[PDB]
Amino acid sequence: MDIELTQSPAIMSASLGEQVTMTCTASSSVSSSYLHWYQQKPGSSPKLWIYSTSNLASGVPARFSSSGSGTSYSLTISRMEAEDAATYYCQQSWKAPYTFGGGTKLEIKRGSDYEFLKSWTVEDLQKRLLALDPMMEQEIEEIRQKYQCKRQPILDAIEAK
């Protein structure tokens, strides 16, 4: 009987400065010290963000907080910033196999509009500009590997002679 972790909502869009709270609910009780949270931006590996329900990994800004116990846990951003746009996973490290939640993708509401964009600081703007490169590189790389897939049976038929 594996411990299913369910994350609501699966996606949520928020405007900067808002306070956002995403949740994780287990199928059975898990002690608080084994519930954890990870953040993943595209193109890079998950980062441990919060361990044991209420401890911030190093480098995790103080606007992040988390609480819960039993079968309901939650992660909260106080005053969201552009860079908190990511996918957040809960995970229990209690019963093997050590299952993850389905994720919550946190997007910037109305972020792709010059109307809203010019009210950002110059810093949040240029950090956001560069945050586009990993996304683009993942898409290109997914294409390159699709064509290594297409190149394969041709190379297998050229040498089947």
Partner 1 sequence: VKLQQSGPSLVKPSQTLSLTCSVTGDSITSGYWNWIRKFPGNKFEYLGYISYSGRTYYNPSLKSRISITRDTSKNQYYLQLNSVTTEDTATYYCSRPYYRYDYAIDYWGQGTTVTVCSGSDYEFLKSWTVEDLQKRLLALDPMMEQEIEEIRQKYQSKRQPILDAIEA
Dist CA 123 CA 82 (whole Å): 10
Neighbours of 55 (CB within 10 A): 13
Q: C-alpha 143: how far from its chain's center?
A: 22
Residue 145 touches which of partner 1, ligand E9R, none (Cβ within 5-8 Å per kind): partner 1
Query: Is residue 156 near partner 1 by the rule CB under 8 A?
Result: yes
Query: Is residue 38 near partner 1 by the rule CB under 8 A?
Result: yes
The 83-122 site mask, x for binding partner 1 (CB under 8 A), equals ----x-x-x-x--xxxxx-xx-x------xxx--xx-x-x
Residue with tokens 């790389």: 141
Query: Is residue 134 near ligand E9R by the rule CB under 6 A?
Result: no
Query: Is residue 15 near partner 1 by the rule CB under 8 A?
Result: no
Tell me the one-letter amino acid at 10.
A
Q: According to CB under 6 A, which one of 2, 98, 139, 141 is a site residue for ligand E9R?
A: 98
Question: Nearer to partner 1 by C-beta: 19 or 121?
Answer: 121
Asked if residues 96 and 34 have their Cβ atoms less than 8 Å apart, the reply is no
Residue 143 touches which of ligand E9R, partner 1, none (Cβ within 5-8 Å per kind): partner 1
Residue with tokens 């898990």: 30
Question: Nearer to partner 1 by C-beta: 19 or 141?
Answer: 141
Task: Say how many residues touch ligand E9R, by CB under 6 A.
Answer: 2
Query: Is residue 54 near partner 1 by the rule CB under 8 A?
Result: no
Dist CA 116 CA 134 (whole Å): 23
Asked if residues 14 and 23 have their Cβ atoms less than 8 Å apart, the reply is no
* Residue 56 phi, psi (nearest 5): -85, 130
Q: Enumerate binding residues for ligand E9R (CB under 6 A).
A: 93, 98
